[PDB]
């Protein structure tokens, strides 16, 4: 019926490529927003920078919940479109929007009365805390807008419409890029201006999504209350992927906070700065993997809805092969142009001291990017078949047990310093990727048996 549905129901390799690319583009613009924003805020001085840092974990928590619900929505929709179960996909989509309201507004009313004492309960004091509270208040006010935007994106990706999913990301992040200097500097609102810029850009994104869903009504799925039937099976289907997805993203954040502590132990404050920089650069080259993982979930889901294991395996292994080849080019570039990249991320007189260490990190750490596709696409298809708990276990094994465990081991038992941290992270990721790939094969051979 729609071009996206025909993509999903067609050749898996074409769908994989045509769904992943617009997702990579969308995530690249989001990445550009964050980098630009970091530049604006850094020129406001330490108080504003500390206010943002204070609020960082709460913000990541909100994103984890919003994105989690979006992934469970996308997977459930994709599977029912595969089964030619149209009324099921309609009902999943409606259940997801009601869930967006419940989750989004719950976040707002739970965190609004808690935020003043919460940020005071930390060690910090003075202006930075006051700014952090005001900053958080603005974003918590749009918690529903955030969740709704992620659920809408999931509905689009769920029905093979990555182009509009991309567009909404581009619109939101692009608008935030325009509003940032206007709100912070031109209107003189300072750091809280960035919060308002974001809130406004999220609201506008909401309008486009709502317009498509409720006015144009040109999606494959139909969203009406008349054909909404309260279903505990649908709720459980969405949450079996969504909730473990949120926990995975939190396992990621928890690992970063642990690795911060490992980095300060190995190289001091400046070593934390090296880790933070090298990690941002590394997470740049992981963007195509995320885009290809989002596509895998949709195509493996639809293939699983068709009860077509051959199509599922083809999509899965092809995503790995392509992600692998991209990462090779990505890793080669980073290791080759390490000094040039390190220049751009040490763009100040004060960050000049950590440049040499950043180069070494860039000639060691990014190597794991080439093994990541084996574990990530495996996690992606676990979500496609609805088994989120398997994806959670695999991600906990990679981020917490293997990444942090091996980094901690090198710092405790050796004198390698920061180099041991990178090597520990690479070894940790290598192991998990192999374990993940083999678990994936087991699960697939079982699928053929059933």
């Amino acid at each position: 019926t729609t071009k996206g549905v025909q993509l999903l129901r067609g050749d898996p390799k074409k769908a994989i490529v045509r769904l992943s690319i617009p997702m990579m583009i969308g995530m690249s613009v989001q990445t550009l927003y964050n980098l630009a924003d970091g530049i604006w805020v850094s020129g406001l001085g330490p108080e504003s920078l500390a206010a943002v840092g204070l609020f960082f974990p709460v913000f990541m928590g909100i994103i984890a919940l919003a994105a989690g619900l979006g992934v469970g929505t996308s997977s459930a929709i994709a599977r029912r479109i595969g089964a030619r179960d149209k009324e099921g996909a309609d009902n999943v989509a409606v259940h997801s929007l009601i869930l967006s309201l419940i989750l989004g507004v719950t976040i707002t009313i739970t965190m609004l009365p808690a935020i003043d004492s919460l940020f005071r309960s930390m060690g910090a004091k003075g202006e930075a805390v006051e700014l952090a509270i005001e900053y958080a208040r603005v974003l918590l006010a749009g918690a529903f807008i955030i969740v709704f935007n992620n659920v809408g994106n999931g509905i689009l990706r769920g029905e093979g419409d990555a182009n509009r999913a991309m567009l909404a990301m581009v619109l939101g992040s692009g608008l935030n890029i325009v509003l940032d200097p206007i709100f912070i500097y031109t209107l003189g609102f300072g750091v809280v201006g960035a919060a308002y810029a974001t809130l406004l850009s999220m609201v506008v994104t909401s309008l486009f999504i709502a317009y498509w869903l409720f006015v144009k009504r040109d999606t494959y799925v139909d969203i009406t209350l008349r054909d909404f039937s309260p279903s505990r099976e649908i709720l459980k289907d969405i949450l079996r992927v969504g909730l473990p997805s949120s926990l995975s993203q939190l396992s990621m954040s928890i690992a970063m906070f642990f690795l911060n502590s490992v980095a300060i132990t190995a190289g001091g404050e400046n070593g934390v700065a090296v880790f933070t920089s090298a990690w941002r650069i590394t997470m740049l080259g992981i963007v195509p993997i995320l885009g290809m993982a989002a596509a895998t979930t949709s195509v493996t889901g639809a293939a699983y809805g068709e009860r077509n294991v051959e199509k599922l395996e083809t999509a899965y292994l092809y995503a790995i092969k392509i992600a692998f080849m991209i990462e090779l080019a990505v890793v080669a570039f980073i290791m080759l142009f390490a000094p040039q990249v390190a220049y751009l991320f040490t763009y100040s007189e004060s960050a000049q001291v950590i440049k040499g260490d950043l180069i070494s990190a860039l000639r060691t750490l990014p190597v794991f990017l080439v093994l990541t596709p084996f574990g990530m696409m495996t996690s992606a298809m676990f979500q496609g078949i609805g088994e989120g708990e398997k994806s959670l276990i695999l991600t906990i094994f990679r981020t917490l047990v293997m990444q942090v465990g091996f980094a901690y081991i090198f710092v405790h038992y050796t004198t390698l310093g920061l180099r041991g941290v990178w090597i520990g992270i690479v070894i940790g990721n290598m192991v998990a990727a192999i374990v993940g790939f083999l678990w994936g094969r087991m699960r697939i051979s079982a699928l053929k048996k059933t």
């Binding site: 330490p46 920078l49 500390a50 943002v52 840092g53 204070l54 960082f56 974990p57 930390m122 060690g123 910090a124 930075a128 928890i254 906070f257 642990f258 911060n260 502590s261 300060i264 404050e269 934390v272 700065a273 933070t276």
Partner: peptide
């Protein structure tokens, strides 16, 4: 243990185990 501490001068959070 577990502690979760913020460095206002580094703008980053730290997670430590008992120790």
């Amino acid at each position: 243990a577990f502690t979760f501490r913020y460095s206002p001068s580094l703008y980053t959070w730290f997670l430590f185990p008992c120790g």
